[PDB]
Amino acid sequence: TTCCPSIVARSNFNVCRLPGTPEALCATYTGCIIIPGATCPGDYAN
Numbered sequence: 409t410t411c412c413p414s415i416v417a418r419s420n421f422n423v424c425r426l427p428g429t430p431e432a433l434c435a436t437y438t439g440c441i442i443i444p445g446a447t448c449p450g451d452y453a454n
Contacts, residue, residue, distance in 0.1 A: 412440030
């Protein structure tokens, strides 16, 4: 469950996963967190 509240964060987040960088690592940079559960609301689903 990846939660981020920004179109500008979410974008470079998924873009980081493209060249072969773990979204897990990139998440730690963006601030967009990847959690097991906890269904984030529609503002953290951006």
